[PDB]
């Protein structure tokens, strides 16, 4: 993994994230939503679990993005939890949780769940 | 379970659901959101898995409610997945998914996730 993870990944919606997997489990990078302007880049940080393991299992990892930068503040944060599978067709399959900050009455509807698959292509 | 499940349950938000657990896994009832008016009752249907099992495990079950009745159409449906634990303090602990019907562009944000615990009291 690690080496394999470092790089640019694209998801089916048109978002791109560039990440560096450091030697001791760290994931650091930026996530850009669209257009191709600075205004869409957000910091991301996460961790990955290096095993990794002798039977081709994927590498579990997760990262977070708080949707605040110098151009936008969306009062929310998303976490992606998934695994990295390398090889010819390497991908990161994830499920994500997007929570928005609410008042206590609306707290019951503050989190959206979804999924994303990221590829190098 | 079954016998134990049949009855009225209340959740921490003030919603009530009355359900009948039939001999062969069926769950049928109504869910009422608030006020205490017919306008807040919706049909619910689900299934429960009778085991049940010799080591005190809970009874898995799930049900669905489409938020449409003769007074309201919220173009959405919620499914609750959880387990029933009986006894002195019987409860049904669940995690739920609420999906609203969207256009294909907004499909990524069509499902909210939450949790609910229902008691007989």
């Amino acid at each position: 993994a690690e080496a394999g993870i470092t790089g640019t990944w694209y998801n089916q919606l048109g978002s791109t994230f560039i990440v560096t997997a450091g030697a001791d489990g760290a994931l650091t990078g930026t996530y850009e939503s669209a257009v191709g302007n600075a205004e869409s880049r957000y910091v991301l940080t996460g961790r990955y679990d290096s095993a990794p393991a002798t039977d081709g299992s994927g590498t579990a990892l997760g990262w977070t993005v708080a949707w605040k930068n110098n151009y936008r503040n969306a009062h929310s944060a998303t976490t992606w939890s998934g695994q990295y599978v390398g090889g010819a067709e390497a991908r990161i399959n994830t499920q994500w949780l997007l929570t928005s900050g609410t008042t206590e009455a609306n707290a019951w509807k503050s989190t959206l769940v979804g999924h994303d698959t990221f590829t190098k292509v | 379970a079954e016998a134990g499940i049949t009855g009225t349950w209340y959740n921490q938000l003030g919603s009530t659901f009355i359900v009948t657990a039939g001999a062969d896994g069926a769950l049928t009832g109504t869910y009422e959101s608030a006020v205490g008016n017919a306008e807040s009752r919706y049909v619910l249907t689900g299934r429960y898995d009778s085991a049940p099992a010799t080591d005190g495990s809970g009874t898995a079950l799930g049900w669905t409610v489409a938020w449409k009745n003769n007074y309201r159409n919220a173009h959405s449906a919620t499914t609750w997945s959880g387990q029933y634990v009986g006894g002195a303090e019987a409860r049904i602990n669940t995690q739920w998914l609420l999906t609203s019907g969207t256009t294909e562009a907004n499909a990524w944000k069509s499902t909210l996730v939450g949790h609910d615990t229902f008691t007989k009291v």
Binding site: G14, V65, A74 | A105, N106, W108, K109
Partner: peptide, 8 residues
């Protein structure tokens, strides 16, 4: 137009 969707 939440930053996690397209575009924005």
């Amino acid at each position: 137009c939440h930053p996690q969707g397209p575009p924005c």
